[PDB]
Amino acid sequence: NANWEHLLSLKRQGDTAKRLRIEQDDTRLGFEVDYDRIIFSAPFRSLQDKTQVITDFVHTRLTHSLEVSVVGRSLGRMVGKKLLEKYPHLEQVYGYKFNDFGAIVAAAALAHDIGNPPFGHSGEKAIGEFFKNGYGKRYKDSLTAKEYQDLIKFEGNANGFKVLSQSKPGAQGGLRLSYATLGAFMKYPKESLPHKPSDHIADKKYGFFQSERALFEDVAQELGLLKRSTTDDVSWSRHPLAYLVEAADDICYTIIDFEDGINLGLIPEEYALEYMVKLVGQTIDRNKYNALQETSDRVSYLRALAIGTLINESVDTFMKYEEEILAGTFDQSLIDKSNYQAQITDIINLSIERIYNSREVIEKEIAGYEILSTLLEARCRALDNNDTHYNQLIQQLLAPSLYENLIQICAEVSTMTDGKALRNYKKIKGL
Amino acid sequence: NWEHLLSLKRQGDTAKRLRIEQDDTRLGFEVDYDRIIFSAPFRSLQDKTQVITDFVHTRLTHSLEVSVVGRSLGRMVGKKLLEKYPHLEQVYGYKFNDFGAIVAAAALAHDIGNPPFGHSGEKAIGEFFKNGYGKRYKDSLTAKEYQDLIKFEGNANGFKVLSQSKPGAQGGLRLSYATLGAFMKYPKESLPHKPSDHIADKKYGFFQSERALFEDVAQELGLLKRSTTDDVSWSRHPLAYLVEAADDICYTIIDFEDGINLGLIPEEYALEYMVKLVGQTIDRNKYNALQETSDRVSYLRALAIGTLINESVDTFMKYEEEILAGTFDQSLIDKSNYQAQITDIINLSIERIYNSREVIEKEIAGYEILSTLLEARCRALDNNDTHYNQLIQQLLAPSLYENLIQICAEVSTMTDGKALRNYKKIKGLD
Ligand SMILES: [Mn+2]
Ligand SMILES: [Mn+2]
């Protein structure tokens, strides 16, 4: 069974001595510094020019990441305060405070989208398609089964972990986030294989590439995560705070996708109160709602309330199943146990029908397949014959072990802004 | 019999519809015209370009002008047929406006199934299945089903568009069987290919998927058999000759008028090419007082179309018996006394319009656009499990032969814009 004293590790990669919570300066608390390191990092700043499914210029992945980190800070503060009541020795002996849990969830949430390719899950699938059926199929017999699985099922979560921890000359350990933050980041503590060994949400995807396996082994050992398999296919039970990072993300994309689609016209405004009345009625001020004269103001009032309702419930679900999560025996997400799962489901379904299957979004994702394939092919052909005049040009333009080279090409194409990607694609194509 | 050729039957009818008992304000031949006007495929001709993409020479206006010339041919031939066969009016109740409405409606629809980029667009579809990706399906198709694809015809796709059953809408527009017979210039299937040099044998008029329908049409109309084998062929409905003459007249004369207005044809050539066609009716002093090029040439065009309409009526009636017996071998315009001038006009249009660099550039771009969409749809058809091919199905289209012919039908009826837009997205370019 896992221990909250080890799960709240302040260790950073390469540390030679232990970091005790009591001995920290509260003005420079490890977990809070993690948040700043992310805000100021080049991968986070690049989210300015990375659009979500809809490209209205005011629907960015930076805003999503920001709002997920805010909701995440709330979730972790409230759970953190209840956990210190249950296990008083964590504050009495180890010096932990409730804002520590707030900070861990907030930093992991803030970073949760940092490694995703452009164009959504279509972007991930364009990359996988490239190595499964495109030019990149040629590498299959030179890679291990799990190196190849990293590629053909390329996963933005796992690319995220690489962005946060990648060593470079003069920058060992990447952003060097606290291990507790890295533990909460990891929604899927498993390798690419075996694929979907169970129906648990933690088994649905994978969380780290082969290139990062040794790194997460260090994190998992320090946190004391529970070994879920020892069959040479490593996987662990989720760090408890990872459920809150997931819940914050789930809450935001459920409610705020709905809001956005109402504002963009894709969802008639009538559905707003219809799908959300159960989630708001115990807290809504009817007088205030009927005075608001603008649709955007009405639906954002409803969204603030729906999000408040879901945070409060998610805290309760965590505390109820707290011992099962600590044992690694909790099989669902926090949101899967919500009493509003009927309402959440109808919301998600309407959002899919009217937004994610809208003609604009389908078009952006189809063009994304072509943009990502073209960039991957220019990179891989340059890797294969670095001697030609053209491939040396391509090398100066796009990038000035075989598996490490391929995964790095994937990481770099994935972290390109939409601006650099399209401009470089157009250049390659003569447009 | 002309009585049977003038069928008011609609697909699925279980009882004969008699001309004498029709409501004049709701006459089936004229209802056909209205159904076409309001149909979504005819409306889409607004965003379809004939050859020059000036946005003021659409396939819609061409279709309209062909139907106007058709109604005029049908009215005049109609009046003369009722004088030759008076029982048709006095006993069966036909009127001369009936023949104008049948010809007008089939002419209005004649272009409805044609792909973008003209004949280049048909040839790109065919080349996709002869030598491109679509080659793989050859062994899974009958010879006639594959021939539908490698020699894709917009005339046959027009017939499909007009008659396709969909859930809640069996039989397409459900036009009168006379209207569909007047539509079918090539009443044969895709094989055998060009069995003679007869104009009715230069292409084919229906795909295998519409074979059963046209069989029912030909039996009701009483069209004469041209084959006693399993390769079905029939002699053209007489009125199909008038639909063809309306189209022949408009493309020859109005393409020339367009070329002059556009600058592709020097205006100096206007009178030289038209003088035989207009020389006895032209008011030369009024021609010289006209101050705009566009007015001078539209005056010449109206004179020439008038000349060619009157002659075509007279050619039809000189050969009516031969046409009723399926022994007429040519088009009406082939018998014209102005055949040589018509040929000079058409050749000048080929030289100055159809072989201009702008038109050539459009067709080359068309080949890629259609080839790309056809490959995207056909790969999506073969592996509909992958994410990309789910997306391809949602963007373009939300039995193998029935599937392949439907993909050609759908790619063919796309507006110029949506084709270029969807092509641009699949290729990533804006
Ligand atoms: Mn997210
Ligand atoms: Mn025509």
PDB file of C-alpha atoms in Angstrom, chain B residues 126-301:
ATOM      1  CA  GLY B 126     -12.304   7.054 -66.499  1.00  0.00           C
ATOM      2  CA  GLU B 127      -8.503   7.142 -66.245  1.00  0.00           C
ATOM      3  CA  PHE B 128      -8.738   6.647 -62.479  1.00  0.00           C
ATOM      4  CA  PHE B 129     -10.368   3.235 -62.969  1.00  0.00           C
ATOM      5  CA  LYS B 130      -8.600   2.229 -66.186  1.00  0.00           C
ATOM      6  CA  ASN B 131      -5.020   2.902 -65.072  1.00  0.00           C
ATOM      7  CA  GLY B 132      -5.095   4.570 -61.637  1.00  0.00           C
ATOM      8  CA  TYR B 133      -6.096   3.340 -58.197  1.00  0.00           C
ATOM      9  CA  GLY B 134      -9.466   2.099 -59.424  1.00  0.00           C
ATOM     10  CA  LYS B 135      -7.735  -0.507 -61.595  1.00  0.00           C
ATOM     11  CA  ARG B 136      -7.808  -2.956 -58.659  1.00  0.00           C
ATOM     12  CA  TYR B 137     -11.580  -3.443 -58.796  1.00  0.00           C
ATOM     13  CA  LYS B 138     -11.646  -4.725 -62.402  1.00  0.00           C
ATOM     14  CA  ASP B 139     -11.655  -8.367 -61.376  1.00  0.00           C
ATOM     15  CA  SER B 140     -14.591  -7.799 -58.993  1.00  0.00           C
ATOM     16  CA  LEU B 141     -16.892  -6.311 -61.642  1.00  0.00           C
ATOM     17  CA  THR B 142     -18.706  -7.501 -64.737  1.00  0.00           C
ATOM     18  CA  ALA B 143     -17.366  -6.221 -68.036  1.00  0.00           C
ATOM     19  CA  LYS B 144     -20.271  -3.760 -68.365  1.00  0.00           C
ATOM     20  CA  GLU B 145     -19.919  -2.558 -64.754  1.00  0.00           C
ATOM     21  CA  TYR B 146     -16.223  -1.848 -65.219  1.00  0.00           C
ATOM     22  CA  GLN B 147     -16.985  -0.232 -68.597  1.00  0.00           C
ATOM     23  CA  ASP B 148     -19.361   2.163 -66.812  1.00  0.00           C
ATOM     24  CA  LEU B 149     -16.330   3.299 -64.812  1.00  0.00           C
ATOM     25  CA  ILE B 150     -13.453   3.400 -67.325  1.00  0.00           C
ATOM     26  CA  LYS B 151     -15.718   5.185 -69.828  1.00  0.00           C
ATOM     27  CA  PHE B 152     -17.769   7.254 -67.321  1.00  0.00           C
ATOM     28  CA  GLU B 153     -20.445   9.278 -69.132  1.00  0.00           C
ATOM     29  CA  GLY B 154     -22.132  12.415 -67.775  1.00  0.00           C
ATOM     30  CA  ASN B 155     -25.176  11.666 -69.895  1.00  0.00           C
ATOM     31  CA  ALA B 156     -25.632   8.383 -67.996  1.00  0.00           C
ATOM     32  CA  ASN B 157     -24.932  10.154 -64.724  1.00  0.00           C
ATOM     33  CA  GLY B 158     -27.625  12.683 -65.646  1.00  0.00           C
ATOM     34  CA  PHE B 159     -30.096   9.816 -65.975  1.00  0.00           C
ATOM     35  CA  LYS B 160     -29.019   8.500 -62.574  1.00  0.00           C
ATOM     36  CA  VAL B 161     -29.365  11.951 -60.940  1.00  0.00           C
ATOM     37  CA  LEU B 162     -32.906  12.353 -62.318  1.00  0.00           C
ATOM     38  CA  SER B 163     -34.130   8.955 -61.170  1.00  0.00           C
ATOM     39  CA  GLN B 164     -32.095   7.855 -58.148  1.00  0.00           C
ATOM     40  CA  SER B 165     -34.084   6.380 -55.268  1.00  0.00           C
ATOM     41  CA  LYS B 166     -33.200   7.520 -51.741  1.00  0.00           C
ATOM     42  CA  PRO B 167     -34.989   6.677 -48.462  1.00  0.00           C
ATOM     43  CA  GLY B 168     -38.184   8.679 -48.374  1.00  0.00           C
ATOM     44  CA  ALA B 169     -37.763   9.571 -52.055  1.00  0.00           C
ATOM     45  CA  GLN B 170     -38.149   6.607 -54.424  1.00  0.00           C
ATOM     46  CA  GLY B 171     -37.617   7.312 -58.113  1.00  0.00           C
ATOM     47  CA  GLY B 172     -35.725  10.624 -57.950  1.00  0.00           C
ATOM     48  CA  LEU B 173     -37.719  13.400 -59.610  1.00  0.00           C
ATOM     49  CA  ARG B 174     -40.156  10.842 -61.080  1.00  0.00           C
ATOM     50  CA  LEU B 175     -40.372  12.618 -64.475  1.00  0.00           C
ATOM     51  CA  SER B 176     -42.819  11.463 -67.174  1.00  0.00           C
ATOM     52  CA  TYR B 177     -41.606   8.568 -69.248  1.00  0.00           C
ATOM     53  CA  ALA B 178     -41.860  10.754 -72.393  1.00  0.00           C
ATOM     54  CA  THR B 179     -39.530  13.287 -70.745  1.00  0.00           C
ATOM     55  CA  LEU B 180     -37.003  10.539 -69.909  1.00  0.00           C
ATOM     56  CA  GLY B 181     -37.169   9.141 -73.451  1.00  0.00           C
ATOM     57  CA  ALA B 182     -36.612  12.630 -74.889  1.00  0.00           C
ATOM     58  CA  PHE B 183     -33.613  12.857 -72.490  1.00  0.00           C
ATOM     59  CA  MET B 184     -31.917   9.638 -73.632  1.00  0.00           C
ATOM     60  CA  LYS B 185     -29.749  10.559 -76.641  1.00  0.00           C
ATOM     61  CA  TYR B 186     -27.836   7.238 -76.324  1.00  0.00           C
ATOM     62  CA  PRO B 187     -30.342   4.469 -75.423  1.00  0.00           C
ATOM     63  CA  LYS B 188     -27.696   1.774 -74.982  1.00  0.00           C
ATOM     64  CA  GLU B 189     -25.619   0.343 -72.122  1.00  0.00           C
ATOM     65  CA  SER B 190     -21.859   0.769 -71.853  1.00  0.00           C
ATOM     66  CA  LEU B 191     -21.126  -2.361 -73.916  1.00  0.00           C
ATOM     67  CA  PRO B 192     -20.719  -3.003 -76.775  1.00  0.00           C
ATOM     68  CA  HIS B 193     -18.626   0.174 -77.158  1.00  0.00           C
ATOM     69  CA  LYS B 194     -19.408   2.247 -80.281  1.00  0.00           C
ATOM     70  CA  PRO B 195     -20.917  -0.626 -82.346  1.00  0.00           C
ATOM     71  CA  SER B 196     -21.346   1.775 -85.313  1.00  0.00           C
ATOM     72  CA  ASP B 197     -20.835   5.411 -86.377  1.00  0.00           C
ATOM     73  CA  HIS B 198     -24.516   6.191 -85.733  1.00  0.00           C
ATOM     74  CA  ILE B 199     -24.708   9.259 -83.406  1.00  0.00           C
ATOM     75  CA  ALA B 200     -26.910   7.268 -81.006  1.00  0.00           C
ATOM     76  CA  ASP B 201     -23.965   4.804 -80.658  1.00  0.00           C
ATOM     77  CA  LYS B 202     -21.120   7.268 -79.946  1.00  0.00           C
ATOM     78  CA  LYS B 203     -21.573   6.976 -76.173  1.00  0.00           C
ATOM     79  CA  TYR B 204     -24.081   5.182 -73.945  1.00  0.00           C
ATOM     80  CA  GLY B 205     -26.902   6.646 -71.894  1.00  0.00           C
ATOM     81  CA  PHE B 206     -27.354   4.646 -68.709  1.00  0.00           C
ATOM     82  CA  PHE B 207     -25.219   2.802 -66.180  1.00  0.00           C
ATOM     83  CA  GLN B 208     -25.944  -0.811 -65.187  1.00  0.00           C
ATOM     84  CA  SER B 209     -27.529   0.514 -61.969  1.00  0.00           C
ATOM     85  CA  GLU B 210     -30.232   2.235 -64.056  1.00  0.00           C
ATOM     86  CA  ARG B 211     -30.591  -0.605 -66.618  1.00  0.00           C
ATOM     87  CA  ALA B 212     -33.808  -1.965 -65.074  1.00  0.00           C
ATOM     88  CA  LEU B 213     -35.330   1.517 -65.075  1.00  0.00           C
ATOM     89  CA  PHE B 214     -34.652   2.311 -68.706  1.00  0.00           C
ATOM     90  CA  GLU B 215     -35.959  -1.117 -69.697  1.00  0.00           C
ATOM     91  CA  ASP B 216     -39.261  -0.135 -68.105  1.00  0.00           C
ATOM     92  CA  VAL B 217     -39.109   3.262 -69.863  1.00  0.00           C
ATOM     93  CA  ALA B 218     -38.374   1.730 -73.280  1.00  0.00           C
ATOM     94  CA  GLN B 219     -41.148  -0.854 -72.952  1.00  0.00           C
ATOM     95  CA  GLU B 220     -43.722   1.778 -71.958  1.00  0.00           C
ATOM     96  CA  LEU B 221     -42.642   4.172 -74.725  1.00  0.00           C
ATOM     97  CA  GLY B 222     -42.509   1.330 -77.240  1.00  0.00           C
ATOM     98  CA  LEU B 223     -38.994   2.141 -78.463  1.00  0.00           C
ATOM     99  CA  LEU B 224     -37.742  -0.118 -81.250  1.00  0.00           C
ATOM    100  CA  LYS B 225     -35.174  -2.747 -80.258  1.00  0.00           C
ATOM    101  CA  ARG B 226     -31.686  -2.265 -81.658  1.00  0.00           C
ATOM    102  CA  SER B 227     -30.313  -5.432 -80.113  1.00  0.00           C
ATOM    103  CA  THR B 228     -31.714  -8.904 -79.509  1.00  0.00           C
ATOM    104  CA  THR B 229     -28.763  -9.970 -77.332  1.00  0.00           C
ATOM    105  CA  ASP B 230     -28.175  -9.448 -73.631  1.00  0.00           C
ATOM    106  CA  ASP B 231     -26.597  -6.097 -74.617  1.00  0.00           C
ATOM    107  CA  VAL B 232     -29.731  -3.902 -74.703  1.00  0.00           C
ATOM    108  CA  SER B 233     -30.087  -0.964 -77.116  1.00  0.00           C
ATOM    109  CA  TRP B 234     -33.133   0.888 -78.499  1.00  0.00           C
ATOM    110  CA  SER B 235     -33.858   3.451 -81.223  1.00  0.00           C
ATOM    111  CA  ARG B 236     -34.033   7.052 -79.933  1.00  0.00           C
ATOM    112  CA  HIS B 237     -37.316   8.583 -78.835  1.00  0.00           C
ATOM    113  CA  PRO B 238     -38.112  10.985 -81.761  1.00  0.00           C
ATOM    114  CA  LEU B 239     -38.142  14.019 -79.457  1.00  0.00           C
ATOM    115  CA  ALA B 240     -34.573  13.203 -78.381  1.00  0.00           C
ATOM    116  CA  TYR B 241     -33.522  14.563 -81.806  1.00  0.00           C
ATOM    117  CA  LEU B 242     -35.024  17.947 -80.869  1.00  0.00           C
ATOM    118  CA  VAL B 243     -33.256  18.007 -77.468  1.00  0.00           C
ATOM    119  CA  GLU B 244     -29.976  17.340 -79.300  1.00  0.00           C
ATOM    120  CA  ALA B 245     -30.640  20.037 -81.934  1.00  0.00           C
ATOM    121  CA  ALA B 246     -31.363  22.590 -79.146  1.00  0.00           C
ATOM    122  CA  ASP B 247     -28.061  21.772 -77.519  1.00  0.00           C
ATOM    123  CA  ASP B 248     -26.187  21.621 -80.893  1.00  0.00           C
ATOM    124  CA  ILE B 249     -27.533  25.073 -81.821  1.00  0.00           C
ATOM    125  CA  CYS B 250     -26.732  26.746 -78.491  1.00  0.00           C
ATOM    126  CA  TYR B 251     -23.146  25.398 -78.068  1.00  0.00           C
ATOM    127  CA  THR B 252     -22.218  26.260 -81.660  1.00  0.00           C
ATOM    128  CA  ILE B 253     -23.662  29.774 -81.680  1.00  0.00           C
ATOM    129  CA  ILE B 254     -23.416  30.914 -78.072  1.00  0.00           C
ATOM    130  CA  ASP B 255     -19.857  29.596 -77.520  1.00  0.00           C
ATOM    131  CA  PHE B 256     -18.866  31.808 -80.461  1.00  0.00           C
ATOM    132  CA  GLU B 257     -20.790  34.746 -78.942  1.00  0.00           C
ATOM    133  CA  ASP B 258     -18.975  34.123 -75.649  1.00  0.00           C
ATOM    134  CA  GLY B 259     -15.556  33.942 -77.300  1.00  0.00           C
ATOM    135  CA  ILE B 260     -16.062  37.359 -78.907  1.00  0.00           C
ATOM    136  CA  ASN B 261     -17.330  38.991 -75.711  1.00  0.00           C
ATOM    137  CA  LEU B 262     -14.361  37.485 -73.834  1.00  0.00           C
ATOM    138  CA  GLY B 263     -11.754  38.624 -76.385  1.00  0.00           C
ATOM    139  CA  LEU B 264     -10.699  35.093 -77.363  1.00  0.00           C
ATOM    140  CA  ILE B 265     -12.191  35.600 -80.845  1.00  0.00           C
ATOM    141  CA  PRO B 266     -11.459  38.854 -82.735  1.00  0.00           C
ATOM    142  CA  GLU B 267     -14.706  40.730 -83.347  1.00  0.00           C
ATOM    143  CA  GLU B 268     -13.583  41.253 -86.957  1.00  0.00           C
ATOM    144  CA  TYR B 269     -14.515  37.566 -87.533  1.00  0.00           C
ATOM    145  CA  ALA B 270     -18.135  38.005 -86.279  1.00  0.00           C
ATOM    146  CA  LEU B 271     -19.791  38.870 -89.605  1.00  0.00           C
ATOM    147  CA  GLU B 272     -17.547  36.635 -91.701  1.00  0.00           C
ATOM    148  CA  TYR B 273     -18.615  33.513 -89.820  1.00  0.00           C
ATOM    149  CA  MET B 274     -22.264  34.469 -89.435  1.00  0.00           C
ATOM    150  CA  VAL B 275     -23.154  35.989 -92.798  1.00  0.00           C
ATOM    151  CA  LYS B 276     -24.573  32.814 -94.301  1.00  0.00           C
ATOM    152  CA  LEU B 277     -26.585  32.165 -91.135  1.00  0.00           C
ATOM    153  CA  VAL B 278     -28.027  35.719 -90.879  1.00  0.00           C
ATOM    154  CA  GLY B 279     -27.620  37.276 -94.339  1.00  0.00           C
ATOM    155  CA  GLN B 280     -31.247  37.369 -95.358  1.00  0.00           C
ATOM    156  CA  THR B 281     -32.700  38.585 -92.046  1.00  0.00           C
ATOM    157  CA  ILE B 282     -29.946  40.914 -90.776  1.00  0.00           C
ATOM    158  CA  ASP B 283     -30.891  44.583 -90.714  1.00  0.00           C
ATOM    159  CA  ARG B 284     -27.408  45.822 -91.534  1.00  0.00           C
ATOM    160  CA  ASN B 285     -28.152  49.502 -90.821  1.00  0.00           C
ATOM    161  CA  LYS B 286     -29.386  48.541 -87.343  1.00  0.00           C
ATOM    162  CA  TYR B 287     -26.313  46.330 -86.863  1.00  0.00           C
ATOM    163  CA  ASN B 288     -24.065  49.311 -87.667  1.00  0.00           C
ATOM    164  CA  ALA B 289     -25.980  51.628 -85.322  1.00  0.00           C
ATOM    165  CA  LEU B 290     -25.403  49.275 -82.386  1.00  0.00           C
ATOM    166  CA  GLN B 291     -22.561  50.728 -80.313  1.00  0.00           C
ATOM    167  CA  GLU B 292     -21.473  47.829 -78.070  1.00  0.00           C
ATOM    168  CA  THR B 293     -19.739  44.669 -79.274  1.00  0.00           C
ATOM    169  CA  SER B 294     -21.927  42.658 -76.890  1.00  0.00           C
ATOM    170  CA  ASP B 295     -25.049  44.081 -78.554  1.00  0.00           C
ATOM    171  CA  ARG B 296     -23.841  43.488 -82.138  1.00  0.00           C
ATOM    172  CA  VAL B 297     -22.962  39.861 -81.454  1.00  0.00           C
ATOM    173  CA  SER B 298     -26.120  39.052 -79.484  1.00  0.00           C
ATOM    174  CA  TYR B 299     -28.099  40.467 -82.419  1.00  0.00           C
ATOM    175  CA  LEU B 300     -26.190  38.098 -84.749  1.00  0.00           C
ATOM    176  CA  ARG B 301     -26.728  35.220 -82.300  1.00  0.00           C
TER     177      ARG B 301
END
